[PDB]
Design an enzyme around this catalytic site. Structure first.
Site, PDB file in Angstrom:
ATOM      1  N   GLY A   1       0.805  -1.215   0.000  1.00 55.55           N
ATOM      2  CA  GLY A   1       0.000   0.000   0.000  1.00 55.55           C
ATOM      3  C   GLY A   1       0.836   1.263   0.000  1.00 55.55           C
ATOM      4  N   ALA A   2       0.250   2.343   0.507  1.00 53.23           N
ATOM      5  CA  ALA A   2       0.923   3.633   0.571  1.00 53.23           C
ATOM      6  C   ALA A   2       1.708   3.772   1.874  1.00 53.23           C
ATOM      7  CB  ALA A   2      -0.094   4.757   0.446  1.00 53.23           C
ATOM      8  N   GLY A   3       2.899   4.355   1.771  1.00 59.35           N
ATOM      9  CA  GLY A   3       3.701   4.726   2.933  1.00 59.35           C
ATOM     10  C   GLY A   3       3.792   6.238   3.007  1.00 59.35           C
TER      11      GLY A   3
ATOM     12  N   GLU B   1      14.680  -6.185   5.509  1.00 60.50           N
ATOM     13  CA  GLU B   1      14.282  -7.505   5.943  1.00 60.50           C
ATOM     14  C   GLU B   1      12.781  -7.741   5.802  1.00 60.50           C
ATOM     15  OE1 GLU B   1      15.794  -8.153   9.902  1.00 60.50           O
ATOM     16  OE2 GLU B   1      15.298 -10.290   9.679  1.00 60.50           O
ATOM     17  N   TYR B   2      12.397  -8.842   5.174  1.00 61.17           N
ATOM     18  CA  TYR B   2      10.980  -9.206   5.072  1.00 61.17           C
ATOM     19  C   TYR B   2      10.480  -9.778   6.393  1.00 61.17           C
ATOM     20  CZ  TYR B   2       6.710 -11.512   3.520  1.00 61.17           C
ATOM     21  OH  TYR B   2       5.396 -11.925   3.381  1.00 61.17           O
TER      22      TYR B   2
ATOM     23  N   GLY C   1       4.180  -8.825   9.902  1.00 63.24           N
ATOM     24  CA  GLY C   1       3.871  -7.404   9.937  1.00 63.24           C
ATOM     25  C   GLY C   1       4.099  -6.751  11.280  1.00 63.24           C
ATOM     26  N   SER C   2       3.351  -5.686  11.547  1.00 59.91           N
ATOM     27  CA  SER C   2       3.485  -4.949  12.799  1.00 59.91           C
ATOM     28  C   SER C   2       2.962  -5.796  13.957  1.00 59.91           C
ATOM     29  CB  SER C   2       2.736  -3.614  12.729  1.00 59.91           C
ATOM     30  OG  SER C   2       3.310  -2.748  11.760  1.00 59.91           O
TER      31      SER C   2
ATOM     32  N   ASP D   1      10.429   6.492  19.521  1.00 61.64           N
ATOM     33  CA  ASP D   1       9.144   6.059  18.970  1.00 61.64           C
ATOM     34  C   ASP D   1       8.970   4.541  19.162  1.00 61.64           C
ATOM     35  OD1 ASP D   1       6.660   6.602  17.757  1.00 61.64           O
ATOM     36  OD2 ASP D   1       7.472   6.594  15.720  1.00 61.64           O
TER      37      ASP D   1
ATOM     38  N   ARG E   1       3.520  -0.904  17.381  1.00 60.95           N
ATOM     39  CA  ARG E   1       3.319  -0.660  15.945  1.00 60.95           C
ATOM     40  C   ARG E   1       4.638  -0.514  15.176  1.00 60.95           C
ATOM     41  NH1 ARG E   1       2.445   4.020  18.479  1.00 60.95           N
ATOM     42  NH2 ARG E   1       3.759   5.779  17.849  1.00 60.95           N
ATOM     43  N   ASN E   2       5.726  -0.193  15.884  1.00 63.51           N
ATOM     44  CA  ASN E   2       7.051  -0.059  15.273  1.00 63.51           C
ATOM     45  C   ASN E   2       7.953  -1.251  15.525  1.00 63.51           C
ATOM     46  OD1 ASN E   2       6.448   2.434  14.126  1.00 63.51           O
ATOM     47  ND2 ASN E   2       7.074   3.523  15.972  1.00 63.51           N
TER      48      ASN E   2
ATOM     49  N   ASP F   1      11.391   1.386  12.239  1.00 60.73           N
ATOM     50  CA  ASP F   1      11.020   2.805  12.218  1.00 60.73           C
ATOM     51  C   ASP F   1      12.026   3.716  12.876  1.00 60.73           C
ATOM     52  OD1 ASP F   1       9.814   5.294  11.949  1.00 60.73           O
ATOM     53  OD2 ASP F   1       7.793   4.430  12.016  1.00 60.73           O
TER      54      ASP F   1
END
Length: 281
Positions: A25-27, A97-98, A102-103, A143, A147-148, A161
């Site tokens: 998606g968008a970043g 890194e993949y 996800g988060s 931060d 989520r990061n 992040d």
């Protein structure tokens, strides 16, 4: 030691070795996708790929690549690995890194109450280990939040992040950092305590949707997030220790890693067990 800021710490990748499989998606600065990277040895690995938007400003390019300049200074199993950048052709790319799952916050929300305590502690130990290295390098993240943190197919958690990175997330920020921008590794330890609560709560939002002014005031008055459901006493105590008003009384990251290692070694300790209301401590 971390040095405050690209080719010093990032490999220039040959775009021929990069393929895109899936658009995510968008970043912030452009598109986010995933794909494959051919290494110089001919090994092929999965990677996360971010692109800089067409018609970017020079500031956008600087801020985008600045993340790579920071990330590339770290080489640790619990810090997202920078595979490299593409700058000699456009669109400009950052290849990392993949991380299949996800988060961490969104992952845990999909799995509420579905992991063992030892699995959760393993996630938390990984995060602590990455932060121990970051702080050893003199980098304050600022931060640190679930989520990061990214989580891979084997549930290994890694710090991501590096955008607020230094040599405004109120819910994750220590009281002294909110009060007068006093950011230190001990303010990252505060944030780690919040991440610990996030993990043990399966991705509940810290302080829910309390008015920001009330999050600031309640925390200052000595109120803390309540124990997550079925939270081991040892882990809630660790949260409270990370959230000490006096930053000098918070544990160091090395101590947090040691605490969690002991809990992993003596899983019976987790059997001692300690809502939307804050508790005065």
């Amino acid at each position: 030691t971390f040095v405050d800021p690209v080719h010093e710490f990032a490999k220039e990748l040959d775009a021929t070795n990069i393929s895109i499989d899936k658009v995510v998606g968008a970043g912030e600065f452009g598109e986010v996708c995933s794909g494959r990277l051919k290494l110089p040895s001919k090994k092929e690995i999965s990677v996360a790929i971010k692109t800089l938007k067409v018609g970017y400003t020079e500031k956008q390019r600087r801020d985008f690549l600045g993340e790579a300049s920071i990330m590339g200074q770290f080489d640790h199993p619990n810090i997202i690995r920078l595979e490299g950048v593409v700058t000699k052709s456009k669109p400009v790319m950052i290849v990392t890194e993949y991380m299949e799952n996800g988060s961490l916050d969104s992952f845990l929300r999909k799995h509420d109450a579905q992991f063992t305590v030892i699995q959760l502690v393993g996630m938390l130990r990984g995060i602590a280990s990455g932060m121990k290295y970051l702080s050893d390098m003199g980098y304050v993240h600022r931060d640190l939040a679930a989520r990061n943190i990214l989580i891979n197919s084997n549930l290994v958690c890694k710090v991501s992040d590096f955008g607020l990175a230094r040599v405004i997330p109120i819910r994750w920020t220590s009281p002294e950092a909110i009060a007068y921008r006093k950011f230190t590794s001990a303010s990252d330890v505060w944030s780690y305590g919040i991440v610990l609560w996030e993990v043990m709560s399966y991705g509940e939002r810290p302080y829910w949707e309390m008015s920001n002014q009330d999050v600031i005031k309640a925390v200052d008055e000595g109120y803390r997030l309540p124990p997550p459901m079925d939270c081991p006493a040892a882990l809630y105590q660790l949260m409270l220790d990370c959230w000490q008003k006096d930053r000098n009384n918070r544990p160091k990251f090395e101590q947090i890693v040691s605490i969690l290692d002991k809990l992993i070694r003596n899983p019976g300790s987790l059997k001692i067990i300690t809502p939307s209301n804050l508790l005065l401590d």
